[PDB]
Chain A
Amino acid sequence: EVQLVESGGGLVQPGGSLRLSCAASGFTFSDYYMYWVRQAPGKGLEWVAYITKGGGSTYYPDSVKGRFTISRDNAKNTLYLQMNSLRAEDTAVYYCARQTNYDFTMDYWGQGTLVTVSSASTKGPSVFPLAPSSGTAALGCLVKDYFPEPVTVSWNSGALTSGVHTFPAVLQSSGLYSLSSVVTVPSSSLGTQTYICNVNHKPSNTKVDKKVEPKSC
């Protein structure tokens, strides 16, 4: 299988620098022209860097030229993007993309890495229970007051997926994100089945398992 894995995205001060990397596998890397394409939250696609097979030449749009440097290492299967003098509007998910052989389209993309340009501080969430009440019952975890994005939430270490909704984070007026993750389950299970939400906010090194149960009354 062809695979592209981006890494290196994170939170950086306005004016700072960051270097992204992309690991390629399952195809002969030096045979292919490569792209970096970025997507600001809720926005469209913008290519930001292009490099030839041997790395001999590089191309960038105006929005980025003079600040980004695309490079590659064909011996060790890796594409790079050096980003300097970062601005708030460089905040985006950055994708590594392979150019289709003998064409100009992009036929494989990585999963993307998020770059956040901000002076706000990193802060890990608190995790609070959304306890099932007095058929189908609903329960969840409230993942409150963190920065930057992203956080991941699983249930029962990934064993519970049906009926799960993890909501998009929303920025509070404090400048911190909050979100809830909920699941609907049989009411008959509430005494018997354990429900634990697994929260990981890697930017702040915050891992939490929260068991959620009916409140004693």
Chain B
Amino acid sequence: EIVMTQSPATLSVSPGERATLSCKASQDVGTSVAWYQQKPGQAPRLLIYWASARHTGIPARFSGSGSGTEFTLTISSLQSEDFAVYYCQQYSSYPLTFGGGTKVEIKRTVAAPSVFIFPPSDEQLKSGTASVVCLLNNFYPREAKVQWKVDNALQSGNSQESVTEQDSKDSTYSLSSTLTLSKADYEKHKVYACEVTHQGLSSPVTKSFNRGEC
């Protein structure tokens, strides 16, 4: 089969600036190459066909070029709604194949997270487990450090993080970190704290609560 290789696995481009994506074929595929846009949670959408023909209803800022083995998708003035994974595809000969995709992030200005901490609910505690949740809301860039402390001890290995996909509308990320303890362990300690390090904060932000206090 003809292998399609997409060069930068990721791209981070400021809004209004030009994004250039590369797709390389292992053999000649002429101009029988298409490009698809796939936003998180959605099906792919045909963008470009015949290497350079814009599909109907696709905005003019999307253009394709190339022939033979080297192809290029250019987004001339990257808009925030263009956050997506972009896939190329050859149909020069059977079997049709896809490239591995290039993920395009919008490089907006730095935004500090708003931080919130949530104690475990009384209802969960009846189950024998305590989940403590730390939320970092609407920040950029994606890189952030979240540290849990329980009565001054850094907790490691007993939390998990989830990060949203970049928000189309404001180009930010949000992040949840969940610290899980047994009820027995939870009730043995007093001070629960989430400390957040991020480029948009002049120094780390701590949100904390004392178990059993309000």
Contacts and interface: CB of A to CB of B under 8 A. Distances in A.
Interface in A164-207: 165, 167-170, 172, 178-180, 182, 184
Interface range, A side? 35 or more
B160 A172 contact: yes
A168 B164 CA distance: 7
Interface stretch (A17-25, A77-85, A103-111): A103-111
A103 to B, nearest CB: 7
B10 to A, nearest CB: 14
B203 interface: no
Given A45-B98, A130-B133, A167 B118 contact: no
A149 to B, nearest CB: 13
Interface stretch (A7-15, A66-74, A115-123, A136-144): A136-144
Given A111-B43, A128-B124, A103 B49 contact: yes
B176 interface: yes
Interface residues of B, number: 46
Interface string B161-179: 1111100000000101010
A95 interface: yes
Interface string A4-45: 000000000000000000000000000000000000000011
Contacts of B161: 170
B153 to A, nearest CB: 20
Interface stretch (B65-73, B89-97, B181-189, B191-199): B89-97
A106 B98 contact: no
Contacts of A124: none
Contacts of A58: none
A46 B55 CA distance: 22
Interface in B118-141: 118, 120-121, 123-124, 127, 131, 133, 135, 137-138
Contact of A45 (B87, B117, B178): B87
Given A103-B49, A180-B176, 11 more contacts: A59-B95, A105-B91, A128-B121, A131-B121, A136-B114, A142-B124, A142-B178, A165-B137, A168-B164, A184-B137, A217-B214
3 A-B pairs closest in CB distance: A104-B91, A217-B214, A109-B43
